[PDB]
Amino acid sequence: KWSPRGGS
Amino acid sequence: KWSPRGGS
Amino acid sequence: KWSPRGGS
Amino acid sequence: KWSPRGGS
Amino acid sequence: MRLTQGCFSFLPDLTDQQIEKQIAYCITKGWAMNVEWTDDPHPRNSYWELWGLPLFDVKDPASVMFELREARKSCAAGYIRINAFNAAYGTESCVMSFIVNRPSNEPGFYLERQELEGRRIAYTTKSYSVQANPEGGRY
Amino acid sequence: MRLTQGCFSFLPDLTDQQIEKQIAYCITKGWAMNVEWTDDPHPRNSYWELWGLPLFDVKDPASVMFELREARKSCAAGYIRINAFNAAYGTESCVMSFIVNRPSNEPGFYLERQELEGRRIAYTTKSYSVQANPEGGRY
Amino acid sequence: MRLTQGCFSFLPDLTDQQIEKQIAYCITKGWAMNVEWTDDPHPRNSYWELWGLPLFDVKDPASVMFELREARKSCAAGYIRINAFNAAYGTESCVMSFIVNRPSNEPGFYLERQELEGRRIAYTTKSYSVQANPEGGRY
Amino acid sequence: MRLTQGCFSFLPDLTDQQIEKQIAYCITKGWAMNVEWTDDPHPRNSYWELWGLPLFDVKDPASVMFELREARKSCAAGYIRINAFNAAYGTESCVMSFIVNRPSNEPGFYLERQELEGRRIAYTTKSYSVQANPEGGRY
Numbered sequence: 001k002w003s004p005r006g007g008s
Numbered sequence: 009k010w011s012p013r014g015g016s
Numbered sequence: 017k018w019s020p021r022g023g024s
Numbered sequence: 025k026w027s028p029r030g031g032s
Numbered sequence: 033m034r035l036t037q038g039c040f041s042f043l044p045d046l047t048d049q050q051i052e053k054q055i056a057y058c059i060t061k062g063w064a065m066n067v068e069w070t071d072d073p074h075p076r077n078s079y080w081e082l083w084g085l086p087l088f089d090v091k092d093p094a095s096v097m098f099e100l101r102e103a104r105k106s107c108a109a110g111y112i113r114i115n116a117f118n119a120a121y122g123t124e125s126c127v128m129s130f131i132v133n134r135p136s137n138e139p140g141f142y143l144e145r146q147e148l149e150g151r152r153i154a155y156t157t158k159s160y161s162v163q164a165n166p167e168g169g170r171y
Numbered sequence: 172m173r174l175t176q177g178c179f180s181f182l183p184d185l186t187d188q189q190i191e192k193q194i195a196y197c198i199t200k201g202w203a204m205n206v207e208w209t210d211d212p213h214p215r216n217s218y219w220e221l222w223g224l225p226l227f228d229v230k231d232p233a234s235v236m237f238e239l240r241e242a243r244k245s246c247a248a249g250y251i252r253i254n255a256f257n258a259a260y261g262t263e264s265c266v267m268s269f270i271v272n273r274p275s276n277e278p279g280f281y282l283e284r285q286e287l288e289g290r291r292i293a294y295t296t297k298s299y300s301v302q303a304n305p306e307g308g309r310y
Numbered sequence: 311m312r313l314t315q316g317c318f319s320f321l322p323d324l325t326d327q328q329i330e331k332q333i334a335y336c337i338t339k340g341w342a343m344n345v346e347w348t349d350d351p352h353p354r355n356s357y358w359e360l361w362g363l364p365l366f367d368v369k370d371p372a373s374v375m376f377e378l379r380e381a382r383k384s385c386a387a388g389y390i391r392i393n394a395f396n397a398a399y400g401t402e403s404c405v406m407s408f409i410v411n412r413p414s415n416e417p418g419f420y421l422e423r424q425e426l427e428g429r430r431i432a433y434t435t436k437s438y439s440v441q442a443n444p445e446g447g448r449y
Numbered sequence: 450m451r452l453t454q455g456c457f458s459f460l461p462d463l464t465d466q467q468i469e470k471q472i473a474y475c476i477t478k479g480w481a482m483n484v485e486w487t488d489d490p491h492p493r494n495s496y497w498e499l500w501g502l503p504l505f506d507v508k509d510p511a512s513v514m515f516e517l518r519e520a521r522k523s524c525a526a527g528y529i530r531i532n533a534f535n536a537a538y539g540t541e542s543c544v545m546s547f548i549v550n551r552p553s554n555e556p557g558f559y560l561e562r563q564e565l566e567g568r569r570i571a572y573t574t575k576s577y578s579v580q581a582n583p584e585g586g587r588y
Contacts, residue, residue: 002032006581007588008010008305008556014303015310016018016166016278022164023171024026024139024444030442031449032417032583033444076284076292139444145354146285146424146434153354156285160444166172166278166299215562215570285563295563305450305556305577311583417583423493424563424573431493438583 033140035073038113038131048097051132055093055114058128063116064088065096067103071110071170072162073138080113100132109135109171135171172279174212177252177270187236190271194232194253197267202255203227204235206242210249210309211301212277219252239271248274248310274310311418313351316391316409326375329410333371333392336406341394342366343374345381349388349448350440351416358391378410387413387449413449450557452490455530455548465514468549472510472531475545480533481505482513484520488527488587489579490555497530517549526552526588552588 040046046054058065065087068080083103087095096114103112112133115126139160146154161170179185185193197204204226207219222242226234235253242251251272254265278299285293300309318324324332336343343365346358361381365373374392381390390411393404417438424432439448457463463471475482482504485497500520504512513531520529529550532543556577563571578587 003582003586003588007578008308008554011304011308011310015300016169016276019165019169019171023161024137024447027443027447027449031439032415032586072281074284142350142440142444144434144436145352146432148432154285154287156283158283162281166281211559213562293563293565295561297561301559305559420489420579420583422573422575423491424571426571 033138035111035131035134035138037073037075038129040130045134046130046132051100051114052093052097054128054130055096058116059091059093061116061118063118063127065090066115066117067096067099068113068115069103069107069110071108071167072159073111074157074159074162080111083107086117104133108168111135138171172277174250174270174273174277176212176214177268179269184273185269185271190239190253191232191236193267193269194235197255198230198232200255200257202257202266204229205254205256206235206238207252207254208242208246208249210247210306211298212250213296213298213301219250222246225256243272247307250274277310311416313389313409313412313416315351315353316407318408323412324408324410329378329392330371330375332406332408333374336394337369337371339394339396341396341405343368344393344395345374345377346391346393347381347385347388349386349445350437351389352435352437352440358389361385364395382411386446389413416449450555452528452548452551452555454490454492455546457547462551463547463549468517468531469510469514471545471547472513475533476508476510478533478535480535480544482507483532483534484513484516485530485532486520486524486527488525488584489576490528491574491576491579497528500524503534521550525585528552555588 034041036042055065066085067083069083070077070080084099087099090096100112100114111131113129113131116128118125118127141157141159144156144158146156148154164170173180175181194204205224206222208222209216209219223238226238229235239251239253250270252268252270255267257264257266280296280298283295283297285295287293303309312319314320333343344363345361347361348355348358362377365377368374378390378392389409391407391409394406396403396405419435419437422434422436424434426432442448451458453459472482483502484500486500487494487497501516504516507513517529517531528548530546530548533545535542535544558574558576561573561575563573565571581587
């Protein structure tokens with residue numbers, strides 16, 4: 001959830 | 009979805 | 017919408 | 025709400 | 033955090049009657065008054081945005097109060113300040129400055145530390161509001 | 172904010188008929204024309220992306236208009252510009268450049284201030300769109 | 311990631327009984343004890359925030375344990391540490407320091423590399439928690 | 450964007466049979482093989498993370514293939530590479546290196562430009578994935 005939120 | 013999220 | 021998203 | 029949004 | 037720039041920031045926000053008295057004190061000296069606005073509160077940000085020309089020969093605080101009222105309902109969320117200038121030989125500079133409007137909340141700043149030669153550090157002060165949104169939509 | 176790079180940015184966006192006339196003026200001089208694109212508008216970003224080779228001996232604006240039409244429907248959101256080059260001894264450089272397509276909205280830039288020796292500051296100009304998304308998805 | 315500052319960070323979190331014993335060891339030497347807090351764990355962040363004055367002539371660990379209990383329920387999420395000072399001629403400095411409270415999770419840091427002359431790099435260490443939120447709301 | 454580090458990055462991703470053949474070529478020379486992993490693809494990031502010790506006297510590619518299979522199902526999303534070392538007098542260095550696993554998508558990098566003396570610029574290359582998430586959760 002905190003990994004796909006940024007750095008597409 | 010990753011383009012409108014930031015850089016209004 | 018792009019102003020309250022960041023800079024609380 | 026502005027604290028859990030970032031800095032996992 | 034509360035921004036502590038200005039001469040009365042350790043006192044509560046001043047009322048309109050309080051502001052009018054300080055203006056009355058500057059005009060009794062013969063000083064010129066002006067109003068400014070900004071959404072970037074960095075301590076080295078010297079030039080705030082000008083609200084019209086300075087009021088040079090106005091001799092009634094009501095004229096200054098009116099202009100401040102307009103800016104309040106016209107400008108975006110941010111900060112407003114009133115300044116007084118003295119053009120007398122030996123001075124020719126500002127002689128008073130205080131904040132008269134603040135945003136609902138201000139997150140503040142943080143420090144970045146670049147390591148150079150030996151134990152020396154090059155510091156940079158950064159604003160949370162500025163880094164997040166463009167001018168006009170920071171607060 | 173409106174980006175003010177180019178020779179006609181203080182005028183409204185130009186119509187297709189307006190663009191064709193300026194092209195007709197450059198070909199009457201014998202200049203070579205080309206079209207470029209970018210999504211990074213930093214003022215020191217010298218090399219925009221090339222759209223094909225320059226049109227050296229084309230003697231009809233319709234050929235230039237066609238190429239611009241293609242780029243418009245082919246490239247991603249961002250900026251497009253038309254340039255004219257003069258290879259005459261004594262010049263051998265560009266002699267005209269103007270913007271001909273803009274994004275729906277541009278947030279602009281902000282300044283970062285690193286403090287060095289004495290009172291000196293090292294400035295860095297930063298783009299909101301670039302810092303937020305990779306090339307192709309900034310606008 | 312687990313922050314490895316302090317003398318016992320390669321051991322599991324210590325129990326209250328364990329903490330009391332270490333305090334009892336420092337007072338048998340005659341050292342002064344104090345408690346500090348911070349939400350910025352950069353390795354060059356020398357000054358943490360002070361929790362009251364140092365306990366100079368307290369001769370019972372229960373007094374130190376009480377103060378730590380208060381901070382725990384009073385301060386925001388972040389880190390807490392206990393220090394011991396020796397004012398004897400030849401020392402006049404801290405002689406012990408260990409962490410006694412941690413946040414639910416810590417993302418850690420990353421490196422930025424600025425390229426200068428030849429092959430030299432100027433490094434900067436950056437914290438994920440700090441860059442994301444202001445003091446008081448980082449964890 | 451596709452990261453172009455390695456000797457075969459201008460060719461499509463290689464199949465398992467393709468990988469085995471290249472390994473068979475390095476062992477016929479007598480070279481030592483090893484496997485590495487990282488989630489920070491900066492071009493000056495010299496030390497990737499080691500997966501066990503190098504295989505010095507293994508004389509069968511099946512042993513190398515097995516280890517790579519384990520890393521694939523054990524490590525987090527990111528990049529994996531195979532290297533070959535030659536310890537002969539006159540060399541004592543790596544003599545081959547190629548990528549053998551990539552993330553679903555890589556956003557790439559952007560440039561920051563600090564203005565120094567005259568017209569000089571100090572450049573910094575920045576990764577979108579790194580700046581957004583800590584190690585372990587970048588892809």
